[PDB]
Amino acid sequence: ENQKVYDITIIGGGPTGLFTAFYGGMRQASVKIIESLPQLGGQLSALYPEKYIYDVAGFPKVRAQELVDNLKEQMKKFDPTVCLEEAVDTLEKQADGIFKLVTNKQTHYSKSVIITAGNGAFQPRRLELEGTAKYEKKNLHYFVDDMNKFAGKRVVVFGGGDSAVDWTMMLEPIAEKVTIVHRRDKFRAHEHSVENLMNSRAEVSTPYVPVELIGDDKIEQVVLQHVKTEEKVIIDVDDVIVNYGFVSSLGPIKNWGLDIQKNSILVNSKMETNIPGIYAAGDICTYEGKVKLIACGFGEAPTAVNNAKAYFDPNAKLQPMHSSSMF
């Protein structure tokens, strides 16, 4: 890329966007996936990677994350450009019909856009304390990418979920001290992971809620409050890590000039929105009879690709070659 006009840009790397990316390869289009999170997989990877799915055609029983791995494998053949940690904010048609898409990182350009944004861009749930916002460019963390930057550091983890415990286990042998804070004594996690949390050098502050962060520019202390007694505890830290889960909402998608009803983008049977060049597929799209199912999003995706391919490549046919004759 740089300055490069792609053919098909996909907003959303959930399962629908992954299969959209694959089928863009089947039609020889230059393909981009733009995804809000630093991982692909949408609801499947973020909100339930361990559940079994029973209604994808041809899988009597498949685990959610292994379906996403299958999908990433299937597309690996045409190597689409994946742009993680980017949330599309503005989307406009410029004077010559090309789309300009602006994220928090950069500008992208595209001949057609297939929005597969599901229930909207995923963000980690924000910490609800009025001071916090100023710390995000410093030592308040919602992701634990490069874990070794916490070697010999004092670190606190807010959250009582399965994901929160696991990040604690990962940090206890890395950090000088690690502490986990949750408002009830029962953690919402696996018995073996709680047992391993209990039996380690990680301090477990329950039933408390954080009530204050102290620091001029970097966080330096955290104030906790017992939920029953109202007594307080103070902790010195080098880094604070929030893990309250994920949230999603349409957000800026409602400012792109699209026809939207009950948080769904309206499409016709070509997966076309009201703006020539823009398509939608998967949980975010709707039409008469639409059913929010993964098998249905997998059918909408090649319809959108094949119709978009006919929109930007006037010398191409709507029907693709049999895949059994291409490899």
Going by C-alpha positions, the residue among 232, 21, 222 that lies closest to residue 116 is 21
Which two tokens mark 271?
């997966």
**135 annotated as belonging to a binding site for a ligand:** no
Distances (CA, A) of 124 to 10, 47, 56, 61, 115: 22, 11, 28, 29, 21
> Does the footprint of Na ion cover residue 25 (CB under 5 A)?
no
| 223 vs 181: CA distance, rounded Å | 11
| 279 vs 302: CA distance, rounded Å | 11
Residue 70's binding partner out of Na ion, ligand FAD, a copy of itself, none, with CB under 5 to 8 Å set by partner kind: a copy of itself
Contact of 73 with 22, CB cutoff 8 Å: no
Residue span binding ligand FAD (CB under 6 A) among the ranges 39-47, 151-159, 166-174, 268-276 = 39-47
Shortest distance in whole angstroms from residue 246 CB to ligand FAD: 8
Residues near a copy of itself (CB under 8 A), total: 55
| 41 vs 18: CA distance, rounded Å | 8
> Does the footprint of Na ion cover residue 139 (CB under 5 A)?
no
Shortest distance in whole angstroms from residue 53 CB to a copy of itself: 6
Among 4, 48, 234, 247, binds a copy of itself (CB under 8 A): 48
| 2 vs 32: CA distance, rounded Å | 13
Residue 168's binding partner out of ligand FAD, Na ion, a copy of itself, none, with CB under 5 to 8 Å set by partner kind: none
> Does the footprint of a copy of itself cover residue 299 (CB under 8 A)?
yes
> Does the footprint of a copy of itself cover residue 153 (CB under 8 A)?
no
Nearer to ligand FAD, 67 or 157 (CB): 67
**Is the preceding omega at residue 60 within 30 degrees of 0, hence cis?**
no
> Does the footprint of ligand FAD cover residue 9 (CB under 6 A)?
no
DSSP state, 20? Answer: H
Residues 237-266 vs ligand FAD: string with x where CB under 6 A? Answer: ----------------x-------------
Contacts of 221 (CB under 8 A, 6+ apart): 213, 214, 215, 234, 235, 236, 237
Among 8, 9, 14, 205, binds ligand FAD (CB under 6 A): 14
Which positions from 59 through 118 interact with a copy of itself, judged by CB under 8 A?
Answer: 59-62, 64, 67, 70-71, 73-74, 77
> Does the footprint of ligand FAD cover residue 292 (CB under 6 A)?
yes
Distances (CA, A) of 157 to 1, 49, 76, 141, 203: 38, 22, 35, 9, 10
| 160 vs 189: CA distance, rounded Å | 8
Q: What is the dihedral of CA 170, 174, 177, 182, to 10 degrees?
A: -10
Residue 8's binding partner out of a copy of itself, ligand FAD, Na ion, none, with CB under 5 to 8 Å set by partner kind: none
> Does the footprint of a copy of itself cover residue 120 (CB under 8 A)?
no
| 301 vs 274: CA distance, rounded Å | 18
Q: What is the dihedral of CA 50, 56, 60, 63, to 10 degrees?
A: -10
> Does the footprint of a copy of itself cover residue 41 (CB under 8 A)?
no
Give the residues lining the site for Na ion (CB under 5 A): 12, 14, 16-17, 42, 116
Annotated binding site for FAD: 16, 35, 43, 48, 88, 122, 283, 324
Give the residues lining the site for ligand FAD (CB under 6 A): 11-17, 34-37, 42-44, 47-48, 53-55, 87-88, 116-122, 253, 282-284, 292-294, 297, 322-324
Give the residues lining the site for a copy of itself (CB under 8 A): 15, 19, 22-23, 26, 48, 51-62, 64, 67, 70-71, 73-74, 77, 268-272, 287-293, 295-303, 306-307, 318-320, 323-324, 326-327
